[model samples]
Target: QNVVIIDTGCANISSVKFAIERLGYAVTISRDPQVVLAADKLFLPGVGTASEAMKNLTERDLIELVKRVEKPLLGICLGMQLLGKLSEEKDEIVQCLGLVDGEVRLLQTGDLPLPHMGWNTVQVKEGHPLFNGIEPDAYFYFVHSFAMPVGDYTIAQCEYGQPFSAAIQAGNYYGVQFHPERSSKAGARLIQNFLEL
Candidate 1:
């Protein structure tokens, strides 16, 4: 299968490439929309500010293309947030792809740290192909200050300060708030599930 990761020219895509490669699959880190859209499966990985990332996608003219993609695709962390309707990063409103009908808002952690960085458990709610061989009590790595609230699109939930969408599915698109490449055994299993799909 052709595995492609859309490099938004924002984050370290090598880690994502290496993770999939370690699973004995050939993965391509791409900036070209043609290459990205041609993949059997697509991976969208991003890091940094929402406005800047949106600018990057605009410069490449991939925003509309990504919104129209029908093939199986997964968004990780910031990339996942980009897949949503809106983002309020640093108190500024940033428009997103809106592939899924939800909004990304600041994590209501109260006294907790700004960025919740570490392994956290994700309680799966709606059974999906992404959790095929994963354990019931699996922990995934997360590092973010904002997240999507639990709603109709939410497939799993995780709580740092309050419960948020840990993993979500909308049609052919899937988004994860955690970094599967950084997560250990369970992460590898989740990646395997995506590959198998």
Candidate 2:
């Protein structure tokens, strides 16, 4: 299937692109509206400040397209945060895609570091198509200061400052706070699952 990766001027585009290709799917990275609209599936990946990324999406008018797309869409890391109602990362309330009813905020003081980088185990809850071939409680790479709080849309949980939503699913939309591309075998399975969808 044709998959388009939304280039929102964030870091780690190469890794994200390579990961999708490794899944045996033809993936293209583009910021053009027509390219995004023609894809069979879309992967919105970003690693940067929430407000800035949102601004980029708004500038291109891709925000509404993302929310209205009938095909499957996946958002990774900061991309996942953009699916929420708002985020407090920039000290100002920034509107998100509103695909999920939640907010993003900085990680509270805890035993772990603020960025929460590196591989961490995900406590898988009820199953979804995204986890079809993946094992429960599998490890995935993560790097972020803020997190999405556990809510009705949360499909998986991971411990850090608190038990936050690691993976969420709402219809054809799926978001993972972790970077599955860099998470090894478990990550591969996750991508494969997404392809199967």
Candidate 3:
């Protein structure tokens, strides 16, 4: 498969690339429009602030390409947050891809803590292709302080201090708040499913 991982310059891209390569697929890391356009599947992974991420996308001329890409695209962590219409990641109301209908905001964890980091069970939507072989309430690795709340597009839900969208799907766009690349077996399965999709 022609897999391409978009270079947003803020992701732990090597880990995500290694995870897919472990599954026997070749992966490329690039911000080139033609390379991205040729991919059968794409990964939008990020682990940084929303404003900066958006700036990178804008500066790289990927904002429109990302919005229009028809390939199966998966956004991880901050990458996923960028798919939302808006974000208040650092108190700035930054505009995003708007691929999914939602907002990314500080996870209302009550008194729990910032950055809900660890393995947590996800409530999968019934028979969703993303979780086809994975069992219900399966655990996935999570590390984020901002999240999108449960909404029409949410295909998987998780709770830290409150329930939030763990994984979401809208047409060809998929976003995972958790790090499936680090979730062990369940994580592997999810990534495999995404690739196979």
- In order, candidate lDDTs are 0.87, 0.83, 0.89
Question: Best-fitting candidate, measured by TM-score?
Answer: 3
Candidate 2 ranges beyond 4 A from true positions? none
Residue 93 of model 2, lDDT score: 80
CA lDDT for candidate 1: 0.87
TM-score, ranked from best to worst = 3, 1, 2
lDDT (0-100) at residue 37 of candidate 1?
78
TM agreement with the true structure for every prediction: 0.95, 0.92, 0.96
Pitting candidate 1 against candidate 2, the one with the higher TM-score is 1
Candidate 3 TM-score versus the reference: 0.96
Error of 1 at 2 (Å): 0.9
Residue 76, candidate 1: Cα error in Å is: 0.3
lDDT (10s digit) by residue, model 3, range 69-175: 89999999888999999999555699989999999888878788788998899888888888988887678988899899999999999978899999998899999
What is candidate 1's lDDT per residue for 1-197, written digit by digit as tens?
89988877655588888899999999887767688778889998888988988999999888887887789999999888898999996757999998999999988899999798988888897567788778778789999998999999999899888999998889999999999999988888898899889
Model 2 lDDT per residue over 1-197, tens place = 88888877667778888888877888888877788878888888886788888888988778877887668888998888899889885467888888888889887847767788877888777666677767775789988888898989998898886889998877778899999888999988888788777
